[PDB]
Structures are given as C-alpha cells and as structure tokens.
RNA sequence: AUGAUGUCAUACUUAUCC
C-alpha cells in the first residue's frame, strides 16, 4: 500500500490517505486497519474461504 | 528539538531490531527528524527493551533513599546500580520523594 | 483583497477628485489588485478628499505620489463602474508591526 | 502559560487543581483568557478564535464579568490592553441584543480610549463604539449615557461628548437630534449644556464633511449658547462653530448667517481665551463670505489682528496665526497693504524660537507662510529669511528650510533675484553641511531649489560637488548615504548643462565606492548611479558598462533592504535599455543569482526582480529561463513560488506564448502536486496578462483544466477556476464560447463548499463566465437551485442569481420562461405574444 | 408601545441597499414581482423593444408608456 | 462561417429631435437621434430643404436627447443619453465636421435596466445644472459650470434617489438665476406591493413632485410635492423669470391642467376633441409630442394629440399668477 | 400547504424531471417548467452532499496531467528531462516551435453546454450504445477474423436474439464493408 | 446496534409501493427503487 | 398600540403641552433634569413627528413601563388637541 | 463501505506583515 508521491511524501493507496512524513505511512501500518477491508473483495473475488 | 513521538518511536524500534544496535548511522539514515547521537540515546532511554518503565515499589524507594546521601551528585552512576537505567526515572523519583515528605 | 481580506471599501458617490497611490503601493490595483493592463483611471469620493483627506493613496493610504488606475480585467467586468473604494477600516494589518 | 505575580489575584480560581464537579465551570473554562493574555502567539490565535465561537454560548455577561477587570487592570501593557479590545470586537460582531444591560459597563472603560496619545488606540476606539451603538439600540445609548452629562468630573462630560459624537456616526444626524436640541435648551445646570455643545463640535469633527444637510438645524441649536450669560458655553459655542465652518466646504454660508452679527460685536468686548475662541470661528468663516461683505468684515477683522500678534498665549498664536492665512489669503485683500502692515511685525513675533521648537506652531507656521508667499510673491519672503538659514539651531534651519522649498516649489524661482541667490546657494550648502539627524527636508530642498532655479545654478556647479565630494568621505556611516543621494537628486541639473567632467568625475568615484561594506551607504551610491543612468545614455557611461555590470553582479548576496533595492533597479534599467554591452554568459549567471533574491520579504524588490528577469528573458530568449524557472523547488508554501510563476508569465509574454507553452503543459505531468498547481497559476497570469491572444491557446489548455479542474486536491479546483475567469474575460466576443460552455460543465459541481477562497474564487469564475458566454446559458443552469427549500442549494443557487442578476439584469428579460399563472396572481406576460 | 424591533444594524455588515438582488429567503411571489418590474423597466428603456410592443398594439407609445407605468406598482398583489 | 456585416441605407426613424444653436452661430441646427445612429440636420431657410450636415453611429441606443447651453454663451451642447452607464456630452464642431465629447462621466452599469440612469434626462435653463435619472429608484443631478477657459465642466453628481418610487417624466423648472428645481411625475408603489387584496393598488394617483437643488448647499432635496387627479403622460416646461410665470403644464387623459408651485392655484382644461368622431367614446385622449416657440414679446406652445390635431397653447396670466388656458387648433 | 410528489408529478406534463427537494419550494409550477425547458442545464449534485465537491478524490493518485502531440513533438520535454536530471541550454529550434504551434496545431476534445462536471467523471466513461453488428478494432484483433464476425454463424442456428427483436446482421436477413457486420 | 448507522442509511422509513404487490419499502430511496423493479413491472404488465 | 394614528405637531401649541411633560417627567424619573425636558422639547419641534421613534427615545428613557404611558398620555392630548378647531387639549379650556 | 465528531502532526493560500 506505501506509494511514494512526485514531491517527496507518501500516499497510501489502501487508506486512500495523504502521509507528510516517512513516520506517517510507517503509522498506517498497525493503524488504518484498511486490511481487514478487504475481506469483501477477497470474497467477491473468491466466493470459497 | 527531539519530541519523541509514537510514530517515530515505532520506526526507531523497527530499525533497531532490523538493522542492529551498534550501528547508529544507519538507524539515523531512515528517519529524517534526529542525528545519530539523539537515535541512540533514545534507543537507550525508552526504545530500550530491558528499561523497567514502571512497578515503582518500596524496595527500590528505599535503596534510592539510601543511595543519594552516600553519593549526593552522580545520578547517572547509580542508574544501573539501582535498577531504574533510565537516568531520569531515578531524578523524577528523588523529585517525588523529596515533595511527598515535604508537605 | 488578497492581502488584506477584512478591509472594507468606502463605496460613496463618485466625485471628480482624481485618485492617486502611494510610491510604496504604485502600479497596483485596487479592485483587482494586479499590476498589469491598466484602462480606466481611479476617481475618488468628495468626503474621501478634502482637505489632508486629499492626495493620498486610496489603498495604502500613506502620501500617494502617481495618479492610481483600475486593471482592464476590472473594466471588463464593470468592476470600476462601481463607488468609490477608498480605504476607510484597518483591522489585522500594520497593529502588531508598530509594537515590534 | 505563565501568570505575572499580580495577575494571580484575577486567575487564582484557576490554580486550585479541583475539578469536574454548571456556571463556576463556565468561568472556570472561561480562562482560556489568559491564553489570549499570555502565552505564544498561536495560543493567542486558536484560543480567540475558540472564544469566539463560543460567544452565543457563554453569552456577554460572565465574559464581561471576567474581562473588565483585566481591560481595568492597573498593570495593563500596551499589547495586552489592545488584545482585550480584539475579543471585545470580535465577541460583539455577534452578539446583538444580549449587550444592552452591559453597554455602560463597557463604555466606562472604553471612553478612555478616545482621548489617548496613541493613534492607532484612537481609530480602534471608536471602531468599537461604533460596533457598540449601532450593535445595541438607539434607545439603549440615549437612555444608558444620560446621567453621565450632569457628572462632576469634566473628564467623562468630555470623553462622553466623543461617545455621542461615535454613536452619531452610526446611528446618524438625524435620528439623535431631537435628544441634543432637547439637551442644549435644558434650564436645569449648565454643565450640561456645555457637555451637549461639546457634542456638536465632536460631531463636526468626526462626520467631518458629512455634516452638510443638517447643518441648519445644527446651527438653530447652538446659536442659542453664544449669549449665555455663563462663559465657558460661549466659548466652547463659537469653536463648535469654528468646527462646522471648518467642515462646511464653500457653502452653507447663510446656514451661518444669524450667528454673525453677535459674533462681530463679540470681537470688540472680549479680553482672553474667549476672543481668540471667535477669531478662530470667524477666521473660518471668511472663506465663505462674499468677497464685498466680506471686504468690510475682513478689513474690520485685520485691526484685531495686528493688534493681538504680541500675546504671550500659544493658543492665541495658533488661532490668529491660521487666521492671518484664510484672512489674509483671500483673494479680495491687496498686497501693498499686507506687505506694509502685516509681514514686519508678522516675521519679528511669530518668528522666533519659541515657535519651531514646538510641532503644531511648527506646522501651521510654515503653511501661512507659504500662503503669504503666495500672495506677495517670493523675493520678499525667502529674501527675509534667508539670512537664517545660517542660525546655530537645527530645527529652526529645518524649518525655514521646508518653507523655502514649499515656496520655490510653488512660484517658482524666476522671481528671484541674482545676490538674494548667492545668498541662497550659500546658505543650502552651508546648512547642508552639517546635519545632525538624517531626514529628506534638508535634501528635497536642496533639489527643488536646484531643479527651479533650472540653469541659473550653473556657476555654482563647482563648490556644490567640491562640497559633495569631500563629504562624500567624511563619514561614510552617517554622511556617505546622505552626500549620495544629493547627487542622485542632482543628476539632471549635472547633465543639462552639459558638465562632462563632473560626470567623469561621478563616475568612476561613485564606481570606486561599490566596494563599501556599509549597506546603508552602498545603497545609497547604487541610487546615485542609477540617477546618472538616466541622464547620460549608454554607450556614453564613463564607467563603460562592460566595467561596471559584472562589477555589480556579485552584490545580489547583500540581504540589505536598500542595497537589494537599488541594485536590482540599476541592474534593472541596464538589463532593459542597453543589454547588448554584456555577453550572454553573465546573463545566465546573472539569472542563477537572481533565483533566490524571491526570498525578499518586501514586495518591490519581487516587483524589480521579476520585470529584469523579463528584460532578460527578451535579452536572451524563452526555452532556457523558463526551463530555469521550471527548476523551482517550490520548497515555501506561503508565497515565494508564485512569483517565480509571474516570472512564467511575463517570459511567455516577452516573446511569444505560441512558443512557450507546450513545455508547461508537459511539466504539469510531473507527479509533484504543489509544481502542478503551480503551473496551473503560470496559466491563470499568463491568460491575464495575454488577454486577446487567447483567442487559440484555449482549447490547447480546456483538456488540461479538465483534469486539473476534476479535482485530485481543493487548490487544483480554486486555481484551475481562476485560470478559467481569466480565460473568460480575455477571450470575450470573439466566438469560441462552445469549449468554454464544455469547461463550464465541469466548473460546476465546485459550487457548493465552505472554503472561502475555493467559494470566492469559483466566484469569479462564474462571474467571468457569465459575461464570455452570456446570462441565458448561465441562467439555464441556475434556475432550478432557486425553488429548493434544503438550506443550502437556495443559499448559493440565490447567491449565484443575484451575482448574474445585479450585472446584465436589462439583458435578462427575453430568458425567463414561461410560468403558469395561479388564482390569485396572472403569472404569464402576455406582451410578448402579441402577434402582428 | 414596547415593539422589541429595531432593525438599525449589528456589525456593519448585510444591510441590503440595492433593489431587484434578493435574498435566499426571498419568496416566489416577491421575485415574481421583481421580475415583473425588472421586465416593465426593461420595456421602458429599450426604444426598439417598446416600438416593436407599440406596433402591434393599436395604442399610442405614450399611452402604453403611462399604461406600463402605472402597472408597475402592486403587479400581482401577495408578495 | 466568418462573416462580416455592413451598413447600406441607414435608419430614417427619428426618436428624437432638438433644435437650438449648435453650430454657434445664427442658424439653428436640428439634432435628430435615430436609432443607431446620430444625425445633424440644418434646413436651408431660403431654398426650404432640409440637408444632413453630419451622420455618426453611436453603436448603441440613444434614449434622450437634450440640448442645454450656459449664461452669456453663443452655442448649445448636446447631452446625450444612451443604453450605457454613463452621461456624455458632445459639441459639434463645423470647423471638423464632428460632435466633439466635452466630459464622459460613468454612472452605472451597461443595459435598459430599471435602476440603470439613461431612459429620462432634464436640462436646466439656465444651464446651471443636468439632471438624469432612471425610470426607478434612481435620480443623479451634476453641475455644469464654465472654466478661466470658456471650457464646459463638470462636477460631482448628487444622487436623489428614493426607493419604490416609479418616475415617468422629468423636467426642469424655469427658474429666474435663483435654486434650480426639477419636476417629475412620481408614484409609490410600496403600498400596492404589500396588499394582496389590490385595495392599496386601486386610488393611487401620480405625485407631482419637484426637487430643488441648493446651489450652496450643493445638495439637492424633494421641496415640493403634491398628487394629481389623474396619471400623467407628459409634462410642458413653461419659461418664467423675466419672461412669463414659472411654471408647468401636466398633459393627461382628456384634461390639462398647468399647476405652478407655491401660491398659484391649479386650473385645469379638458383636451378639445373632433366633432362627431367616428372613434370609440370610450377611448381617451392624450398629447403626443409638444414644442415651445419661445420670443421676446410673448410666448406660445404648440402640442399635437393622439389623433395628430396640433393646437395651438396659449395661457393668459397675471402680474404673479396664471389666469387661463387658452387652446385653439392650428391644423391637422 | 406544500402539495405531495405524486399530485405534483400528476399535474407536471414532464414528470421524468421532478425530483423529492422540490415540493419544499415557494412555487413548484415554476420550478417544473424552468426543469423542463428546451436547453437548460441542471443543477450540480453538492447541493445535498457534505464534501463541497473536492474531498471525494482523497486517496485517487492518478496521472497529474498529460501534454499534448503538439508539445510532445517539439523535444522540449526530454530537454526539460535532461535538464531536471542534471539539476537534481538546449536551443533545439526556434520556427519549429512555431510550426507546431500554427501548422501541426491539433484541436482538442471539447464539451456540450449540458456537458457539466460530474463528482468523479473519471470512471464513467459512457460512449453512445455500441450494440448487435458494431464492435471496436482491437476486439477484433482478440476475435483475429480476417476483413460475419463468426457468432453471427450461430446467430443463423439459435435465431434473433430476445434482447434486440429489430436485428438485422449481415448475410442472413440484411443482405457490410468495414468492421459494421448488422444494423 | 448500529443505530446511527441506520439512522444515517435511511432505515426503518415507513414507505409502501402500491403498484409493486402491495410490497412495503424501509426507506425512500428504497421506495422509489421499488416502484421501477422487475417486481413492479410484472406486476403492471399483470394487471395490464 | 396607541401610537399608530398618524397626528401633527402643526396644528397644536406647545406652550400647554410642558406642565403635563414637566409632570410625567417628574412622575417617571423622580426629579427634574435638563435632558428629558431638551428631548421632548425636540420630539415636538418638528411640524410632523414620529411617536414611534419618540416612544423608543422615552420607552427605554425609564425602564420600559413607565415610558409607554408616558407616550400613551401625550399621544391622547395631542389628539384631542389636533382634532379641536382651537387646537388646544382638554386641560386648558377649564383652566 | 462512505459519513460523524474529537486529541494531534503535515501541506497549502492570502503578492499578509517589521
């Protein structure tokens, strides 16, 4: 999901959030729980667990 | 400078535990907001693994209190002497010890 | 303006005094606030120049020295068909810069 | 943030550590106070910001109840006591009907600040007096401020009397007469009387020239004091007089009229302060008499006044001293009589060192003698004063110094004689020469005592620059900059008069001082040259501009605000005229230095700083600089890139944008944000400054704005609505509305926001776009969003339509539909059909 | 007589002094009477608009001036 | 498809006309306003021809034409009033073949808005001042005085404005050197705007109402004012001073009634109709147009009915007041 | 006092306009007939939303912006490249740039007047109806039939299809040039 | 519970499409879905 | 309320009108000033005036209960002054 | 899976200003 930007910072592409600094997107790690998200599309790509 | 936040505290632990503990250049290379000096200080005030951050008992009030007559200045020597290794935990506790018997 | 966003304009009666800036705010506007394509020149209000009140800056405020003029794109859009824009107010600016 | 040791008698409450338990934790929350007090300056911001939202809640009483004693804290600072004055404002731009039992309770300590040394506390004052009134009611004032007439002290009747004068500017003339034209007629006591008389002179004040049209009634009141049989009511009377005349611009001359014949009488009978009281009075009236009645009257007036120069008291001599100028410069009086009676005993009493020592006498002083010069003519005044110029005192030197310099720069210098101007010459260098402050008068005398007297000076050429050269070492800290900005001044008189050697001289001496390190001075020289730039051309410079340019290349590093200054115009004006003596290489250079002189925090030198960059720009050729440009770091959000941005413009002006643009629109592809909006902005100035030539560019920048304007971030959408206005005025009438109606489209979901410059700016827009594309498109977006009830889309919907409704609103008729009429109402225009 | 209404002002701001702007509280029939007025004025300036309403009509120019006039008060009648 | 329009015949429609020295000299032009179009006309008094001295294109719609001059003067200007935000002044030069802008002062915005000045212009006749105001809601008044010179000037205009208030001719009062006044038919439809049962809209008559402008004040007020008994179409400046009483002339629906201000009581005159007419009796009448013929001796009027009858107006008067109207038809 | 949706819809000769903010208007009639005009334009979609129409695209990272042929074919980019690549000069031409300014111009994709900005417009890439005998070249390539596209031999066996009952496809009941094999 | 969510959805909106079998909807976006449906236009073919 | 009937100062004295102000005054405010007497002096000066900004200027004067009666009292006698031929209020045709 | 509020950094604008 760490995706860098053309200036120099972070976005994260499963948060779909902005990160000012290198600490920020290392933060959205054990937060911005965007992984447990997607279960609904590992299920509506995968209809089996 | 120096505020020790819990983002940059994390990334701190994440490099000393990948990277290693006798090497603070490369722990400073990969956080954009301290030196090398100031990393492993924290590294070894509050990132430290083995610091005992709290459970301040009777024990260890009374091995302090017997310990700052014998050696009035000197803080950072009887750090590891007592226990706490902090080298700000034991000057909170004398602060608190010194105001709780005052009164 | 863009500088200065809770300044107030006077908007009174248009007279024939002529307007003028300061040679600290020459060239630019007053509505606009721009320093390119000037067309129509800048006329104050009666009450705004009479006496000291007259030959002073209609922005700034200070000693105008040059005749001041509203930008084309102003013009165009008949936004100096309009009162007189004289500054009268002055909040959040040059208050705090005095003490220091 | 920390507490003064006596402020803890106010904000103890706050110190015990009790807490969480209905009002005492109002007042207890309420000490966010003394973060505005005390504190950085961020806490000042956030917390008076939170006070403020917080007013509805908290309401006007335990706020007050907890600031007035601080605002009437002994101890008060300055900073602090006007920080007060902030909240108090920006808590009472809200609350409207809740102050009314509060009202005196603020007046009481604000009326102190209306009579202040300070200014800035003067203007603020009565600001929030004016919020004060005109926020509570008519009723409110009138009924609260009565009993503070009849009070003991003078102090409050007078700073009350200003009160009266702030809430009839808001309130207006009018609608207060009745109480003053009731108070002035009041039998009980006289100080009342006094208070309200004071009151109309406040009011004349203030309003100023606004009191026009009430100005009869006004003077049927207070014509009534001047018979008084008290004194003090007489005198503040004819002042309050004097004041309305002083505002009462040539006319209402017969409003005034029934006051005149006591007032004449007066002037006979009257020993003190009282007289000098009316011949203020009448002093301004006499301009607006006829020029036959006022004939007599004036020359009834000049006895009095010759005889009463010789007082001792100053406010006598402030009176009959602006007296002498409206009387006597009055186009109905004769020199001779003037010349014989009044300037001897004028320039022995008046001129003296009392006087100039003072600042109003100093002023005022200075203006009637001007005046009388304008009337005598020149060679008299100047030649009486002359011989002061040479006195031991600066002021006094100063003084007559600007009075010379106001008269030659009226008259003019042809009267003067040939030793009288000896005797000037000498005596501007001579006072010149020593100087124990730093100011202009003694500078832009001497100018424009040169540039009148035009090429009558020409003997005198020699000793000036003799004199300004040997100044020109001195002292270099406190004289240098001084002896070089009278050769800037002095320039053209040097050149006209065809001089070559001194301008050899200026030259390569004033060239010979680059090297200085003081900036105060350097900054002064680079001005000297620079004057000399503009009299001998180009190719002429004895310092030859292949010497000097490079030489001053490498001062860009100065930071001095007046070094930065005049070099970057010298650099300016060479830059421009000539630039072909430099080769292309120091250009470049020259521009790689000039990329951080943005730093500036002044606007001038941007100003200076991006127009060069221009010239250089025509000097050189497009691709490069603005590739140059395009390099920015971009590194400082507020400002310090957009000007680099007005640089993109003015190069893509410089030669054609027919060239340019292509590399733009390929660097907003860089995935950097703030460089995108950044060249988004290079194409807002860039429409603006090219107007017309849009005519094709847009549909090379309509796709772009389309994926700037879909929006990835707020500034994309404001910049791209800017760049889309101007584009909307520029191209107006000449036929390409079609992709500007397609840009429309997608401008017009931005329109619902919050933020105040993406709503203002999508503003403009849609203002410009209402012009380029002509009310009934616009129209037929808008009509819809006016029926809903939903508390916003009528909000902005009906913004929108008044905003296309107060422009063009005689081209709107043909474009409202057709509407279906009810039972009561007949809803259909039937004109229209009417079918021949 | 206590009325409790006094529309003077609060902090210098709003205080509509232009006529035909409206507001976002503006009803239907009040914009429908502005309109209608703004329509009548309109007729009343343009020399070639009232030519053209002239013409077709057997009425005289100044007579459906006066008639345009004096309907510009109270068009409809509920605001 | 880029075209390019062209102009082959001009407009021949005239909607309005002045007549007056604007050559400077003793013949007397006829300024006509067109449509588009400005037009200079000067009738031959020997060969009886009319000839177009000068045609310019405005480039937009004239809506008043007056002509004013000042004391001790030998030409009349030409005040213009188009679609525009702003009062301009011209003075034909012979010499040039052009009318020539004296002053261009902006007022308001572009368009035949109802708040826009431009549709009604008065001119003193003194030439002291110049009033132009709006159809509603807005009146502005500048001052037209000489320089060293001789060159005409203009000052700051005073606004006179008064909301819902509906004006429907101006014209200025003739007045002896003394404050300028200028009648205006006025009508308040305020009330008529809050009645939805239309009672308030029914018995509103027209106000005439006359606003003097205090030359040394330099602001003018609404002195007099007072309503009519029936709605007025247009009014009739009638010259006073040293020649005849102040004073002017309401034209209405089959009644004139001349009612000068002060002390002079109003009479009123029927309009005289055509003898077995084969109109509708339930149509009115009103005037159409209407000149002055102003001389030394004495002074007539000449106004032309709906039907085209032009009479010939005559109003006997008195040392101070007006005694009777006196009408009679010239021709058809 | 205000009438319902369905009295509103009833008495409206266009009902497929009214919408459910519509009844809380001072005049619904009116309302009705101006959304009802010839060539009028809607309101935008954040009259009722609560992200002021720019704080939907938070986490979208898409590409910034896209030069034009007329710019690419110039070489001032790679230049500009080359030159960020050695800060991190050219003087290529100079009638070249005017060339592809004046005569190698390209005219960009404009919009309609009805054409307004949606919310997002990056996703709904809608074109026309491409229906039953018309299809894209690269499908083609996919498909790799030399110039019936082969399922309309099975168009002969099972029959006309349910979904579009007016078909014709080339060679069965429409007796083709290009890639357009039924109408 | 999410009640907030609920209130925020649009849930337990009282709401009945006559026209889709007498059918009851939660909400009114879900009332308005349901009276253009298969279920509905069935139901309109029907009755004819 | 009362103060809704348009009147006119013109055609009623002012002379007769001071002793029942003088004595409303004295009744309201307890003693006898200067600036309530100045005020009613200028609310009847003009030839048409207002009774509503009259009543604001004297309904909040005193506290707000005593001044509606005040204006109440004056509007009564100068209607019947205004409404006689003589112009005069009841109070001075018995004395 | 939006949205809600709130502690808390981070960028951006106002040609903001000694």
Redesign the pocket.
């Given at each position: 999901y760490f995706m860098k930007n053309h200036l120099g910072s972070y976005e994260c592409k499963l948060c779909?959030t902005?990160h000012?600094?290198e600490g920020?997107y290392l933060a959205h790690t054990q937060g911005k729980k965007?992984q447990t998200?997607?279960a609904?599309?590992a299920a509506k790509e995968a209809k089996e667990a | 400078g120096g505020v020790w936040?819990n983002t940059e505290d994390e990334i701190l632990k994440a490099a000393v535990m990948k990277y290693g503990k006798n090497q603070w250049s490369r722990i400073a290379s990969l956080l954009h907001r301290k030196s090398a000096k100031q990393c492993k200080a924290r590294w070894y005030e509050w990132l430290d693994p083995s610091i005992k951050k709290t459970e301040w008992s009777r024990e260890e009030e009374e091995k302090l209190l017997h310990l700052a007559k014998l050696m009035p200045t000197q803080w950072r020597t009887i750090a590891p002497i007592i226990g706490r290794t902090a080298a700000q935990c034991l000057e909170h506790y004398e602060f608190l010890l010194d105001k709780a018997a005052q009164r | 303006?863009?500088?200065?966003?809770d300044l107030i304009f006077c908007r009174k009666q248009a007279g024939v005094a002529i307007g003028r800036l300061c040679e600290k705010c020459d060239?630019?506007c007053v509505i606009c606030?721009?320093?390119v394509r000037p067309c129509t020149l800048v006329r104050i209000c009666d009450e705004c120049n009479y006496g000291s009140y007259q030959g002073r800056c209609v922005i700034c405020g200070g000693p105008g020295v040059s005749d001041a003029y509203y930008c084309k794109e102003c013009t165009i859009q008949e936004k100096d068909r309009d009162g007189c824009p004289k500054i009268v107010n002055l909040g959040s600016?040059?208050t705090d810069?005095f003490y220091? | 943030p920390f507490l003064k040791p006596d402020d803890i008698q106010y904000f103890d409450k706050l110190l015990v550590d009790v807490d969480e338990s209905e009002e005492q934790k109002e007042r207890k929350i309420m000490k966010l106070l003394l973060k505005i007090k005390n504190g950085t300056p961020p806490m000042r911001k956030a917390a008076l910001r939170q006070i403020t939202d917080k007013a509805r809640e908290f309401g006007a009483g335990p706020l007050f109840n907890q600031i007035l004693p601080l605002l009437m804290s002994p101890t008060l600072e300055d900073q602090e006591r006007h920080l007060l004055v902030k909240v108090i404002d920006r808590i009472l731009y809200k609350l409207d009907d809740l102050v009314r039992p509060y009202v005196h309770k603020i007046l009481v300590v604000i009326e102190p600040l209306l009579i202040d040394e300070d200014y800035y506390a003067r203007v603020e004052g009565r600001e929030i007096i004016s919020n004060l009134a005109k926020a509570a009611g008519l009723a409110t004032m009138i009924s609260t401020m009565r009993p503070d007439i009849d009070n003991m002290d003078e102090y409050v009747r007078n700073t009350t009397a200003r009160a009266f004068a702030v809430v009839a500017s808001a309130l207006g003339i009018p609608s207060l007469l009745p109480f003053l034209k009731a108070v002035c007629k009041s039998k009980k006591s006289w100080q009342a009387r006094h208070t309200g008389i004071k009151i109309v002179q406040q009011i004349a004040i203030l309003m100023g020239c606004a009191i026009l049209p009430h100005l009869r009634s006004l003077v049927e009141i207070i014509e009534h004091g001047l018979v008084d049989e008290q004194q003090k009511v007489r005198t503040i009377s004819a002042l309050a007089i004097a004041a309305l005349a002083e505002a009462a611009t040539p006319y209402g001359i017969e409003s005034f009229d029934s006051v005149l014949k006591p007032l004449w009488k007066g002037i006979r009978q009257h020993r003190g302060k009282g007289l000098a009281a009316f011949l203020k009075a009448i002093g301004y009236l006499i301009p607006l008499m006829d020029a036959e009645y006022a004939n007599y009257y004036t020359r009834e007036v000049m006895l009095i006044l010759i005889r009463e120069f010789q007082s001792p008291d100053e406010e006598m001599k402030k009176i009959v001293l602006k007296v002498v100028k409206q009387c006597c410069g009055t186009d109905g009086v004769e020199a001779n009589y003037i010349k014989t009676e009044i300037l001897p005993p004028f320039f022995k009493h008046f001129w003296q060192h009392r006087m100039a020592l003072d600042r109003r006498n100093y002023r005022q002083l200075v203006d009637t003698t001007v005046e009388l010069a304008n009337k005598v003519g020149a060679a008299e005044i100047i030649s009486r004063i002359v011989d002061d110029l040479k006195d031991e005192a600066e002021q006094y030197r100063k003084m007559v110094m600007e009075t010379i310099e106001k008269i030659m720069g009226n008259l003019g210098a042809a009267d003067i004689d040939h030793k009288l101007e000896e005797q000037l010459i000498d005596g501007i260098l001579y006072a010149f020469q020593e100087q124990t402050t730093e100011d202009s008068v003694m500078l832009n005398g001497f100018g424009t005592v040169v540039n009148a007297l035009g090429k009558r000076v020409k003997p005198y050429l020699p000793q000036i620059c003799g004199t300004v050269l040997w100044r020109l070492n001195n002292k270099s800290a406190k004289v240098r900059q001084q002896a070089a900005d009278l050769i800037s001044r002095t320039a053209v008189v040097m050149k006209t008069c065809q001089e070559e050697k001194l301008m050899g001289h200026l030259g390569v001496v004033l060239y010979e001082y680059l090297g200085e390190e003081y900036p105060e001075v350097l900054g002064s020289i680079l001005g000297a040259l620079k004057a000399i730039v503009n009299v001998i051309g180009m190719h002429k410079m004895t310092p030859p501009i292949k010497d000097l340019l490079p030489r001053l290349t490498p001062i860009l590093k100065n930071r001095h605000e007046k070094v930065q200054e005049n070099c970057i115009d010298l650099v300016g004006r060479i830059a421009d005229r000539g630039a072909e003596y430099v080769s292309a290489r120091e250009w470049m250079r020259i521009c790689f230095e000039l990329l951080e002189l943005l730093k500036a925090?002044?606007?001038?030198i941007?100003?200076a700083t991006?127009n060069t960059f221009g010239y250089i720009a025509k000097a050189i050729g497009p691709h490069d600089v603005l590739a140059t440009l395009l390099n920015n770091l971009?590194?400082?959000?507020?400002?310090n890139?957009?000007?680099t941005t007005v640089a993109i413009a003015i190069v893509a002006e410089t030669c054609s944008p027919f060239t340019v643009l292509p590399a733009l629109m390929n660097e907003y592809r860089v995935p950097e944000?703030?460089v995108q909006?950044?060249v988004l902005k290079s194409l807002s100035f860039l429409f603006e400054y090219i107007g017309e030539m849009g005519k094709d560019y847009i549909y090379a920048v309509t796709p772009l704005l389309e994926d700037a304007l879909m929006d990835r971030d707020l500034?994309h959408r404001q910049t791209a609505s800017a760049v889309v206005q101007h584009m909307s005025l520029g191209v107006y009438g000449f036929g390409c509305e079609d992709s500007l109606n397609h840009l429309l489209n997608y401008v017009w979901p931005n329109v619902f926001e919050t933020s105040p410059?993406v709503i203002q700016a999508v503003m403009g827009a849609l203002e410009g776009l209402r012009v380029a594309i002509g009310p009934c498109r616009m129209l037929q977006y808008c009509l819809q969003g006016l029926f809903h009830p939903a508390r916003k889309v009528r909000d902005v919907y009906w913004k929108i339509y008044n905003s296309i409704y107060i422009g063009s609103q005689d081209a709107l008729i043909a474009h409202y539909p057709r509407i279906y009429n009810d039972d009561k109402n007949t809803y259909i225009r039937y004109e229209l059909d009417y079918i021949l | 007589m206590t009325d409790r209404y006094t529309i003077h002002s609060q902090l210098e701001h709003l205080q509509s002094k232009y006529i035909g702007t409206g507001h976002a509280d503006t009803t239907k029939w009040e914009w429908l009477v502005n309109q209608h007025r703004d329509s009548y004025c309109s007729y009343m300036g343009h020399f070639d608009l009232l030519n053209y309403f002239a013409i077709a009509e057997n009425e005289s120019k100044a007579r459906v001036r006066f008639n345009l006039m004096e309907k510009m008060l109270q068009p409809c009648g509920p605001p | 498809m880029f075209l390019y329009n062209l102009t082959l015949q001009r407009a021949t429609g005239i909607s309005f006309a002045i007549h007056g020295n604007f050559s400077g000299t003793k013949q007397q032009e006829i300024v006509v306003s067109r449509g588009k179009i400005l037009e200079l006309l000067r009738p031959d008094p020997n060969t009886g021809k009319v000839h177009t001295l000068l045609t310019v294109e405005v480039f937009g719609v004239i809506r008043s034409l007056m002509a004013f001059r000042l004391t001790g003067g030998t030409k009349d200007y030409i005040v213009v009033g188009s679609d525009s935000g702003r009062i301009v002044i011209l003075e034909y030069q012979p010499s040039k073949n052009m009318f020539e802008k004296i002053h261009q002062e902006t007022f308001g915005k572009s368009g035949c808005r109802r708040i826009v000045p431009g549709q009604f212009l008065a001119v003193d006749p003194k030439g002291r001042a110049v009033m132009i105001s709006a159809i509603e809601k807005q009146k502005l008044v500048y001052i037209l005085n000489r320089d060293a010179a001789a060159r005409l000037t203009i000052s700051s205009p005073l606004e006179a404005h008064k909301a819902n208030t509906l004006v429907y001719h101006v014209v200025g009062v003739d007045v002896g050197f003394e404050n300028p006044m200028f009648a205006c038919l006025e009508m308040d439809y305020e009330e008529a705007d809050n009645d939805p049962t239309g009672e308030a809209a029914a018995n509103t008559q027209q106000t005439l109402t006359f606003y003097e402008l205090d030359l040394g004040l330099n602001h003018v007020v609404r002195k007099y004012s007072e309503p009519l008994e029936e709605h007025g179409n247009f009014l009739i400046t009638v010259p006073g001073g040293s020649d005849g009483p102040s004073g002017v002339l309401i034209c209405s629906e089959n009644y004139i009634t001349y009612k000068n201000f002060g002390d002079q009581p109003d009479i009123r005159c029927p309009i005289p109709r055509r003898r077995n007419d084969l109109d509708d009796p339930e149509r009115g009448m009103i005037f159409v147009c209407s000149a002055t013929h102003k001389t030394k001796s004495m002074f007539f009027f000449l106004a032309q009915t709906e039907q085209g009858d032009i009479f010939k107006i005559t109003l006997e008067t008195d040392e101070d007041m007006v005694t009777e109207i006196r009408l009679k038809y010239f021709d058809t | 006092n205000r009438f319902t949706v369905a009295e509103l819809k009833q008495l409206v000769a266009r009902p497929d306009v009214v919408e459910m903010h519509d009844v809380t208007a001072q005049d619904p009639k009116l309302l009705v007939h101006l959304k009802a005009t010839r060539n009028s334009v809607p309101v935008p979609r954040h009259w009722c939303f609560?992200?002021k129409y720019l704080?939907?695209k938070?986490g979208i990272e898409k590409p910034p912006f896209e030069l034009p042929d007329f710019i690419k074919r110039t070489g001032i980019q790679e230049m500009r490249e080359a030159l960020q690549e050695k800060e991190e000069k050219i003087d290529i031409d100079y009638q070249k740039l005017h060339d592809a300014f004046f005569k190698w111009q390209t005219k960009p994709k404009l919009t309609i007047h009805g054409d307004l900005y949606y919310e997002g417009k990056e996703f709904e890439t809608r074109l026309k109806e491409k229906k039953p005998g018309d299809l894209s070249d690269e499908l083609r390539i996919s498909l790799g039939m030399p110039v019936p596209p082969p399922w309309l031999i099975a168009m002969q066996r099972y029959g006309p299809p349910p979904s579009y009952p007016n078909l014709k496809i080339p060679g069965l009941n429409s007796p083709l040039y290009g890639d357009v094999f039924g109408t | 519970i999410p009640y907030?969510?609920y209130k925020?959805h649009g849930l337990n909106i009282n709401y009945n499409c006559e026209i889709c079998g007498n059918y009851t909807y939660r909400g009114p976006k879900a009332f308005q879905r349901h009276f253009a449906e298969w279920r509905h236009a069935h139901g309109m073919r029907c009755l004819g | 309320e009362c103060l809704e009937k348009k009147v006119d100062m013109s055609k009623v004295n002012l002379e007769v009108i001071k002793p029942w102000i003088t004595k409303r005054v004295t009744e309201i405010l307890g003693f006898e000033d200067d600036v309530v007497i100045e005020f009613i002096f200028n609310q009847l000066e003009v030839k048409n005036p207002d009774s509503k900004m009259m009543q604001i200027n004297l309904t909040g004067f005193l506290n707000g209960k005593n001044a509606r009666e005040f204006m109440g009292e004056l509007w009564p006698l100068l209607l019947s002054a205004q409404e006689n031929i003589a112009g005069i209020p009841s109070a001075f045709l018995e004395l």
């Open positions: 779909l902005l000012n600094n920020s965007h998200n997607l609904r599309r | 936040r | 303006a863009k500088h200065h966003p060239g630019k606030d721009s320093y600016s040059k810069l220091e | 925090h002044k606007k001038a941007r100003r991006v971009k590194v400082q959000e507020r400002q890139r957009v000007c944000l703030n909006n950044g500034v410059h | - | - | 609560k992200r704080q939907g938070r | 907030w969510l925020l | -």
